[PDB]
């Protein structure tokens, strides 16, 4: 499923992402936009043998287990396949742990290169949350 922008913002707001660890809602919608383009089934292989999964592209070396990545830490203790549902719960929860563990949103390459320092609030405007 490809979430709509506002549709995604409303779902993320229900989970409590607005101001989660000090990050306003727009930051989360923004990271998803540039990480996956709102596609819950997006996957991308990386140079370290890992793969990024889901709408928030959770990495298989550090956070989830996809059974094919060397040196897997599985810190969210979850199979990567569980992060590909049209319901973003599993992703939001692992994302909360990632940011909760001090990793900050700086942990997302797309957020760092496309959201950091921008008008992130714009990503929730017109949405009527």
């Amino acid at each position: 499923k490809v979430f709509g922008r506002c549709e995604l913002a409303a779902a993320m707001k229900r989970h409590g992402l607005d101001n989660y660890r000090g990050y306003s809602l727009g930051n989360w919608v923004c990271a998803a936009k540039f990480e996956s383009n709102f596609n819950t089934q997006a996957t991308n292989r990386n140079t370290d043998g890992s793969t990024d999964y889901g709408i928030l592209q959770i990495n298989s070396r550090w956070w989830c287990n996809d059974g094919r990545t060397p040196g897997s830490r599985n810190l969210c203790n979850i199979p990567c396949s569980a992060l590909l549902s049209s319901d973003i719960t599993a992703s939001v929860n692992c994302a909360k742990k990632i940011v909760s563990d001090g990793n900050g949103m700086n942990a997302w390459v797309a957020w760092r290169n496309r959201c950091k320092g921008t008008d992130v609030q714009a990503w929730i405007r017109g949405c009527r949350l």
Partner: protein
């Protein structure tokens, strides 16, 4: 002529996977990186310049493959990459 090379033993008995990838960045630069993945260790040997090549070590991130060394950060996402430090956008090729 001659040539001498020093080698470091990578820990563990896990299978080693090596790969060389050519890139071209937005500043004209063109170089080749060597990726080494063995168990918990994952490295990237990157020539951050014409006379300086660094052994980067994979560090924790949410997305992509992030590597660190010196004052640089080499972060790859699929065929794309970004070199931060004195980010520059690069593509495989």
């Amino acid at each position: 002529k001659q040539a001498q090379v020093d080698y470091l033993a990578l820990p563990g008995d896990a299978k080693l996977d090596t790969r060389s990838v050519d890139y071209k960045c937005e500043n004209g630069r063109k170089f080749t990186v060597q990726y080494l993945n063995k168990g918990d260790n994952s490295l990237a040997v990157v020539p951050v310049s014409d006379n300086s090549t660094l052994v980067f070590s994979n560090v924790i991130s949410a997305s992509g493959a992030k590597y660190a060394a010196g004052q640089y950060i080499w972060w790859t996402k699929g065929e794309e990459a970004t070199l931060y430090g004195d980010g520059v956008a690069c593509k495989e090729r």
